[PDB]
Design a protein around this ligand. Structure first.
Ligand SMILES: COc1ccnc(N2CCNCC2)n1
Ligand SMILES: COc1ccnc(N2CCNCC2)n1
Lengths: 264, 265
């Protein structure tokens, strides 16, 4: 992988692996989500990062994901090369936004796109902060200054409010626990695990006959290594679903989201 | 990746990914196990498979893993290039063997090695069988004819008998279930998931202070998408040795048995 000529975005090719594909012999949405995360880490490293930006390290500040939105048109097949282009942008003092475009390396056509909103947080108190200058000046040297949006459309799926699932849920997967493979190098549950846990309550009949076109996910609280999660789903309709991840015990909300599926 | 000059083995370089590493910023043993599986699939495809032969497809036969043995000296760090060389060999009518050598792409030194025994099974009845003559000739064209062993040694840990864990276990992880990411393209639980499930009963203190040097795993029965697994461990020992057992949560049916060896960091 490498930064583009202007140094304001980063590109990387990935060959789809055998264990990365599902029953259709195409990459799973979790494989896609891991590749977005990977190209994002390489972009951050190529422009001199740890995630932290020097002034975040002096203030014990970290970036946490608030939202993740992914729209796939075609899933790359096992053995295909997929090229992902990523870039960052400041959103005033709200937070930071990371966007991605996925292309077929052979045809050069867009096969998917993604967007994510990150909020500032103190890693000790776990308290959300607003982007207090300085960080915003150091982010301006690596970001495009004119807006560059993977989802430009006025009134689009990536910025819609997500409601809370009402009990009883139509479908459920109870007792989900993270194992060591679900943790990252800092022992926190990978943001991709939440996507997998959300999809666990989708019936196998929907998976076998439909393709996941869109997924939007809100992140409210992190799941601990020793926490148990319940995944809840309800059809709201193409097939549309409303999702909710909560702690098995007290019912504390950790995630909420929506998925859109089309018949194959 | 590509086959070697003689066409009797296959090589592939892999750059270690951010989500593939643990607390030490080095690849997990499950990442290593996925890369061995990946280079094995590419070797099989490069020599005209898809991993059944023509005779196996005609008879509804598949290869199932009976044993997986991995010995790591150095785990590649996040961002490093690792090169894996793999090859197959016929073991008469018993089954087949797949071997791997892992090297640091920069220094060219061996940083790990692995071996796996595969047995023939009818896809429908699930009954094991000895390799027929037609199958032995079909892969003798892709295998070295003189023995080539990743673990040559007189009495190596790769061929040792594994005993059955006695109740009560010292450590345990109960209620392990596979999710969709644990399934392969044919909807069967990935062999690497079993490794992860085995390691779930190892205490977090051992993981934090030791490095996994060796792991040997016996496969007896497959875990279904709707099956629940219990992982059991007992210390059998500066080095730490463990005895492991995976069994179905309900009836206590054995699915796996194994041993791990760890050294202090
Ligand atoms: C804004 O999204 C997120 C995501 C993950 N954790 C959190 N906080 C919320 C404040 N308490 C600590 C955890 N917020
Ligand atoms: C020897 O290795 C394995 C691995 C997985 N399943 C099996 N069988 C044994 C026979 N019954 C069906 C399952 N054997």
């Amino acid at each position: 992988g490498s930064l583009t000529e202007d140094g304001l975005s980063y590109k990387e090719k990935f060959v789809v692996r055998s264990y990365e594909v599902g029953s259709n012999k195409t990459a799973t949405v979790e494989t896609i989500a891991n590749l977005l995360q990977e190209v994002g880490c390489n972009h951050a490293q190529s422009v001199g990062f740890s995630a932290t930006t020097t002034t975040m390290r002096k203030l014990h500040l970290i970036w946490v994901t608030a939202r993740m939105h992914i729209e796939i048109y075609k899933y790359p097949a096992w053995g295909d090369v997929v090229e992902i282009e990523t870039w960052c942008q400041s959103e005033g003092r709200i937070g930071t936004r990371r966007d991605w475009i996925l292309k077929d390396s052979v045809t050069g056509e867009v096969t998917g796109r993604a967007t994510s909103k990150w909020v500032m947080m103190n890693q000790d108190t776990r308290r959300l902060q607003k982007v207090s200058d300085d960080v915003r000046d150091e982010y301006l040297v690596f970001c495009p200054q004119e807006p560059r949006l993977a989802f430009p459309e006025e009134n689009n799926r990536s910025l819609k409010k997500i409601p809370k699932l009402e009990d009883p849920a139509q479908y459920s997967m109870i007792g989900l626990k993270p194992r060591r493979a679900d943790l990252d190098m800092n022992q926190h549950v990978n943001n991709v695990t939440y996507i997998g846990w959300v999809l666990e309550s989708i019936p196998q009949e929907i998976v076998d006959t439909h393709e996941l076109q869109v997924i939007t996910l809100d992140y409210r609280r992190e799941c601990q290594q020793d926490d148990v999660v319940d995944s809840l789903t309800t059809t709201t309709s193409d097939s549309q679903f409303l999702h909710l991840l909560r702690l098995s015990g007290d019912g504390q909300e950790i995630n909420r989201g929506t998925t859109l599926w089309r018949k194959k």
